């Protein structure tokens, strides 16, 4: 789907009262556009954290509020978190490495790190190790929405659910997701 389609869907969600949304972007031009539109939480996602950092600069210059950068190591997370205007990181890691990553980020004074993993099982391991914010995603979204609701009922807070169309976004909201991530490769 195109960026205009994603903007329309995000505005529709907001008009329904669904305000706890995060917009994912994959280029600096899109980051500027989403920020200029006034969306309050933007995920900048590039293959390399350096590309995300350049997108964060474009979003900040266009007025962004909260900017989350993707990373796959603790070192990359620290580089992003130290960048002006960046307010959080989405760290793709494994349960094996999460203890060390958590300790490293904490010692540096950073807490706003969202963990994601390759399987819902590994994400549950990350929560056990002390991950306080997680992102759940699945091929069909329905699996992710169900897992988030189960964890929420087990007392887990700050679950972000990735969604690929507006029906899934609404279901994730209704199930109590802390935030809903709108992924651009979806059907909007
Ligand atoms: Cl605009
Ligand atoms: Cl918003």
Author numbering: 1 to 188
Quote the original article.
Finally, we attempted to design a TBF, a challenging protein topology that is of paramount importance in biology, as its structure is highly proficient in supporting enzymatic active sites, making it an ideal candidate for the design of enzymes with new catalytic functions. The TBF comprises eight parallel-paired β-strands, each separated by an α-helix, resulting in long-range interactions between the β-strands. The TBF has been a longstanding challenge in protein design, and it is only very recently that several studies have successfully designed this fold. Previous TBF design strategies imposed symmetry and parametric restraints at both the structural and sequence levels. With our pipeline, we could design TBFs without any constraints, allowing greater structural and sequence diversity and even asymmetry, which could potentially accommodate more complex enzymatic sites. We experimentally assessed 25 designs, five of which were monomeric, folded and highly thermostable in solution. To confirm the accuracy of our design, we solved a crystal structure of TBF_24 at 1.34 Å resolution. Our asymmetric design showed noticeable structural deviations from the initial symmetric template, with an overall backbone r.m.s.d.Cα (root mean square deviation computed over the Cα atoms of the backbone) of 2.06 Å. Comparison of the X-ray structure with the designed model showed the r.m.s.d.Cα and full-atom r.m.s.d.fa (root mean square deviation computed over all the atoms in the structure) were 0.80 Å and 2.12 Å, respectively. These structural comparisons demonstrate the remarkable accuracy of our design approach, further underlined by the almost identical side-chain placement in both the core and peripheral regions of the protein.
Here we use a robust deep learning pipeline to design complex folds and soluble analogues of integral membrane proteins. Unique membrane topologies, such as those from G-protein-coupled receptors, are not found in the soluble proteome, and we demonstrate that their structural features can be recapitulated in solution. Biophysical analyses demonstrate the high thermal stability of the designs, and experimental structures show remarkable design accuracy. The soluble analogues were functionalized with native structural motifs, as a proof of concept for bringing membrane protein functions to the soluble proteome, potentially enabling new approaches in drug discovery.
